[PDB]
Design a protein around this ligand. Structure first.
Ligand code: HEM
Ligand code: HEM
Ligand code: HEM
Ligand code: HEM
Ligand SMILES: O=C(O)CCOc1ccc(-c2ncc[nH]2)cc1Cl
Lengths: 141, 146, 141, 146
């Protein structure tokens, strides 16, 4: 579970990404596709070229959904309810891939927010991403 | 780096007893019931709506036969799994876009089916052998991804 | 989450296991130790050969806890809370290992339940063991 | 695990700028903070009650230094990694009893640390290289387990 300290750290670190939502999401996705090529099997319908509008768009949708979750950190099952529906019944991305994206999001945040990325915040963000993944996969079966 | 001489024998011996068509159909059927998201790859397969229907679906049976047939062939080359499945590995990446994690799920489902069908005879040491094998096949199938 | 059919399936299957739960537990451990040798790292103090009484005793505690989890399949987190603490804060078994043992429990059940282990029951048992696993690690951090 | 030549070149170039002691104690420190269960082997290290205490603990730093020291040293042999790490592998299995998953958690913490540290220079392609390295080292470290 996210502790209140966890919730404080996430809100602080993420409010900090702010307007770079789209930029950081796209970077995270690109880190993922490159480091973990198997993840591209979910995007054979994207131009996965560095800088592609498709990846930039998805990045923003991912960041915005994460912005939402932070904004409703106490009530994430409900706030992400339609998204978990989408992933459970249509996209059907194997659960293992969420840890890979979550990892690349951590790496992205570390590379952009050196001041904010303390060991304690690193830990809180890792738990947070994990909880989002859990919510997004809660309806799989 | 994969599969001891003796474990090879447990594999060979148990597999001599296996009706590959039966097992393949059962294992693919169970993959799709137990991990329903794997259904995303068989949209054209027809009725997959409940456990009954999945297990009775003729296209699932057909394909389970094909898949496990390829698996069977590979058991004859336990020392060269990568080279054996390289063709299918690139097919599964370039043409089919199958997350290689699926091969690991199927491996574990097949292990369950072997256990369910053979009972006491699927002994811990025989399971151990088969775990190494399915891991090896999954690894070989994943190897040409890029 | 565990549906009513899941709970019905687990109770049925586990009910059929009945008095062999203990035996099936040690078997599952034996299966795990041979199939996934990395798991032996948590038991340096055990004789791990076949027939081991240390393995048999532990298998019985595992099975008993699963029986008890079944008896409280409605309130699993509290029923297992002691075990959570223990695993979280002393045993500190890496989370990846719960999937290995769960898989071996599944295999053990399959090998002893020719009639009961249907696809639907298999699906439910796997869900059930995953939930137990989730509960047992829910306090790790 | 089959790093291209430019990938190896990228690895070494970046590592040439790494303060091993500091990054060593940063990474093992963060491992113990981020995955508290990893502390199980270090109850003889003193205080681990807080992030600050764990990051501050000199025995942590010390071990961090010793481990990234061996990692650092292994980077010179990206050719055959499991060879160069064989003996340390045996040691971690038979005497130390370290679940090899621990190596994988440490690999991802190390990557996070290189990211935090080098920032912009830690490009995605430089990351992809380091992911292969840290996976390779973990596989190598696990390979002798039994
Ligand atoms: C933090 C984890 C994740 C979050 C927050 C997330 C969020 C989202 C959002 C907001 C969308 C778009 C929904 C819409 O169009 O209204 C989406 C779609 C999608 N996601 Fe997820 N997702 C996550 C994990 C993953 C992972 C790990 C994969 C595969 C590796 C994946 C694959 C996809 C795909 C293929 C789509 C459809 C893309 C398209 O056609 O535009 N997602 N996700
Ligand atoms: C041991 C593991 C596997 C082996 C050896 C294998 C082998 C094969 C073979 C030989 C074919 C060709 C079918 C034909 O000749 O007509 C095939 C097709 C295919 N496989 Fe795999 N397979 C494996 C696992 C999987 C898994 C786990 C999935 C998805 C979860 C998958 C998805 C597919 C799909 C979607 C096709 C094309 C089916 C069609 O024609 O519509 N495979 N596979
Ligand atoms: C279904 C999953 C699991 C259940 C239900 C379970 C349950 C238990 C129980 C009932 C005990 C005895 C605690 C007591 O003394 O009251 C125990 C202890 C223990 N468990 Fe777990 N456990 C599970 C998974 C695991 C796994 C996956 C590992 C490692 C691979 C593990 C490692 C241990 C160890 C080393 C002990 C104590 C051994 C000793 O007495 O020296 N457990 N567990
Ligand atoms: C790249 C990763 C790692 C490398 C290269 C590495 C290498 C080493 C080396 C060189 C030693 C000293 C061997 C000796 O004293 O004979 C050692 C010892 C040790 N390692 Fe690892 N190690 C790694 C990861 C880990 C991790 C992640 C853990 C625990 C979470 C761990 C636990 C230990 C322990 C407890 C010792 C003994 C320390 C002592 O006796 O003071 N190692 N390792
Ligand atoms: O396989 C995964 O990594 C998790 C996703 O799929 C599930 C796996 C297991 C369960 C479950 N069902 C009951 C308790 N835990 C639920 C879901 Cl949605």
């Amino acid at each position: 579970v996210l502790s209140p300290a966890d919730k404080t750290n996430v809100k602080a670190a993420w409010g900090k990404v702010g307007a770079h939502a789209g930029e950081y999401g796209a970077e995270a996705l690109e880190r993922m596709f490159l480091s973990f090529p198997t993840t591209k099997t979910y995007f054979p319908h994207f131009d996965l070229s560095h800088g592609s509008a498709q990846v930039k768009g998805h990045g923003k949708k991912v960041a915005d959904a994460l912005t939402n979750a932070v904004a409703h950190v106490d009530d994430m099952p409900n706030a992400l309810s339609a998204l978990s529906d989408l992933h459970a019944h249509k996209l059907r991305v194997d659960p293992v891939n969420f840890k890979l994206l979550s990892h690349c999001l951590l790496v992205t945040l570390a590379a952009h927010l050196p001041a904010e990325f303390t060991p304690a915040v690193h830990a809180s963000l890792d738990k947070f991403l994990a909880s989002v993944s859990t919510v997004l996969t809660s309806k799989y079966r | 780096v994969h599969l001891t001489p003796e474990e090879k024998s447990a594999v060979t011996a148990l597999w001599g007893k296996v009706n590959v068509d039966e097992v393949g159909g059962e294992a693919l059927g169970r993959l799709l019931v137990v991990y329903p998201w794997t259904q995303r790859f068989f949209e054209s397969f027809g009725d997959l709506s409940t456990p009954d229907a999945v297990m009775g679906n003729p296209k699932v049976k057909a394909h389970g036969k094909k898949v496990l047939g390829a698996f069977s062939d590979g058991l004859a080359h336990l020392d060269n799994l990568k080279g054996t499945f390289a063709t299918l590995s690139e097919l599964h990446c370039d043409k089919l876009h199958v997350d290689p994690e699926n091969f690991r799920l199927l491996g574990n489902v097949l292990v369950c089916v072997l256990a369910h069908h053979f009972g006491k005879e699927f002994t811990p040491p025989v399971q151990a052998a088969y775990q190494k094998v399915v891991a090896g096949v999954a690894n070989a199938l994943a190897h040409k991804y890029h």
